[PDB]
From Swiss-Prot:
UniProt subunit comment: Component of the RISC loading complex (RLC), or micro-RNA (miRNA) loading complex (miRLC), which is composed of DICER1, AGO2 and TARBP2; DICER1 and TARBP2 are required to process precursor miRNAs (pre-miRNAs) to mature miRNAs and then load them onto AGO2. Note that the trimeric RLC/miRLC is also referred to as RISC. Interacts with DHX9, AGO1, PIWIL1 and PRKRA. Associates with the 60S ribosome. Interacts with BCDIN3D. Interacts with AGO2, TARBP2, EIF6, MOV10 and RPL7A (60S ribosome subunit); they form a large RNA-induced silencing complex (RISC). (Microbial infection) Interacts with ebolavirus transcriptional activator VP30; this interaction prevents TARBP2/TRBP binding to DICER1 and thus allows the virus to counteract host RNA silencing.
Name of the featured protein: Endoribonuclease Dicer
Phylogenetic lineage: Eukaryota, Metazoa, Chordata, Craniata, Vertebrata
Consequence when changing E245A: 5-fold decrease in activity
Subcellular location: Cytoplasm; Cytoplasm, Perinuclear region
Function: Double-stranded RNA (dsRNA) endoribonuclease playing a central role in short dsRNA-mediated post-transcriptional gene silencing. Cleaves naturally occurring long dsRNAs and short hairpin pre-microRNAs (miRNA) into fragments of twenty-one to twenty-three nucleotides with 3' overhang of two nucleotides, producing respectively short interfering RNAs (siRNA) and mature microRNAs. SiRNAs and miRNAs serve as guide to direct the RNA-induced silencing complex (RISC) to complementary RNAs to degrade them or prevent their translation.
Family that this chain belongs to: Belongs to the helicase family. Dicer subfamily.
Length: 272
RNA sequence: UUUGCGAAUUCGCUU
RNA sequence: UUUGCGAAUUCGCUU
């Protein structure tokens, strides 16, 4: 075995998105507000690189890379776990083509092994889980399960499922609230008429959503017939209101998912 | 939101 | 010759 190096990818929102730049009128999500973050596990030390900005949805995030631990060993089983999770991040979360990126969390900041094992256990790790509700086993809504979630529609896009940040819980709406489109009276009807979906819960609030994808390179700030059609499609996509009962919750929390989309930027800076 | 997914028509590039 | 390379316009898909 060889001794290990563990680095924290420390993230702080040093300049939040000004009102004039917040075109999609989002909430701002400072990375520092949640303890669980990312890190890098290497065989050899990383040369001390200065702080650098990535430009995210919430504004300007300062990226630092501090040493957490060195000189320690890890078992074969632990590295195999860390590695598989490394590959999951880039292939399933970020959907793409330094030795190991891995999740850290406090108990002080350390390798979050239990988090990784939970992800392996989960059934919404790759696609859409089979969940069966009836009148006697109806869907139950827990507000806190949607406080920091990434949800995926169970009822479409099976080939490659869409993942959305939960952007708002509308506690004033229910599957019986009026439907935005006129061809349907309610949400319940829409999903029944169009998708043949029955709901066991009719008290559940509905979900406002935001798409999870973004450009690879975030090192610079954001500031035509097919490009136009996409702008409208992406706008309709973001104004979608979802029924919780119809969505699986992804095992990767939303606050971590936000940080994961910064990774290719950071890895690229560290190499070139 | 990066070349979102999928159809149709028009046009340029070779010797 | 497999979705050849690159432009333009029209249209469908989400709630």
């Amino acid at each position: 075995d060889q001794p290990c190096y563990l680095y924290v990818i420390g993230m702080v929102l040093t300049t939040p998105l000004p009102d004039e730049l917040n075109f999609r009128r989002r909430k701002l999500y400072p990375p520092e507000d949640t303890t669980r973050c990312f890190g890098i596990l290497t065989a050899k030390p990383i040369p001390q690189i200065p702080h650098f900005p990535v430009y995210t949805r919430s504004g300007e995030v300062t990226i630092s890379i501090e040493l957490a631990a060195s000189g320690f060993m890890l078992s074969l089983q632990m590295l195999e776990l860390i590695t598989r999770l490394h590959q999951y991040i880039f292939s399933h979360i970020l959907r793409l083509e330094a030795y190991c990126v891995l999740p850290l969390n406090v108990v002080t900041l350390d390798i979050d092994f239990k988090f990784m094992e939970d992800i392996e256990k989960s059934e919404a790790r790759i696609g859409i889980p089979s969940t069966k509700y009836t009148k006697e086993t109806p869907f139950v809504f827990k507000l806190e399960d949607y406080q920091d979630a990434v949800i995926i529609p169970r009822y479409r896009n099976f080939d490659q499922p869409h993942r959305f940040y939960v952007a708002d819980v509308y506690t004033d709406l229910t599957p019986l609230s009026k439907f935005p489109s006129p061809e349907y009276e309610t949400f319940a009807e829409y999903y029944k008429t169009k998708y043949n979906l029955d709901l066991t819960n009719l008290n559940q609030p509905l979900l406002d959503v935001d798409h999870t994808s973004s450009r690879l390179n975030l090192l610079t700030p954001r500031h035509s017939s097919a490009e136009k059609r996409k702008a409208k499609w992406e706008s309709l996509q973001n104004k979608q209101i979802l029924v919780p009962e119809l969505c699986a919750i992804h095992p990767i929390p939303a606050s971590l998912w936000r940080k994961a989309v910064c990774l290719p930027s950071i890895l690229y800076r560290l190499h070139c």
